[PDB]
Amino acid sequence: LVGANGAGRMRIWVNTQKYRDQNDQEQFLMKQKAVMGISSAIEGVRCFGAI
Amino acid sequence: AGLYTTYQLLEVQRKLKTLPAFFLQWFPRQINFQEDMIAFDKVIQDVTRV
């Protein structure tokens, strides 16, 4: 959803993936009844401790 | 006339119906075999569990 000069450009995705839960139930990876906005500036780090 | 009405036979009007192939487009693989039966092995591996 973008304005002419490129302003305002929300970029839309839909997530419906289901993973197999620990109880073996199948549940949605993304909360289906909700919307998330996120940016690369979350700068998340995948963090691994000592084995 | 009198004994019988004369006629001209004009060309015969044949109507050869057919059932042209539509579904056999999704069955492109042909196997002619003398074994009794055909066998498939189907395998599902869910790899999405946490």
Automatic annotation (TrEMBL), chain A:
Superkingdom assignment: Viruses
Localization: Virion; Host cytoplasm
Assembly with partners or alone: Homomultimer.
Function: Assembles to form an icosahedral capsid. The assembly is primed by the interaction between capsid assembly protease and portal dodecamer, and major capsid proteins assemble cooperatively to form the procapsid with the help of capsid scaffolding protein. Major capsid protein forms hexons and pentons of the icosahedron. Viral genomic DNA is packaged into the procapsid through the portal vertex. The packaging triggers a dramatic reconfiguration of the capsid shell.
Family in the record: Belongs to the lambda phage major capsid protein family.
Protein name: Major capsid protein
Portion of the full sequence shown: 254 to 304 of 354
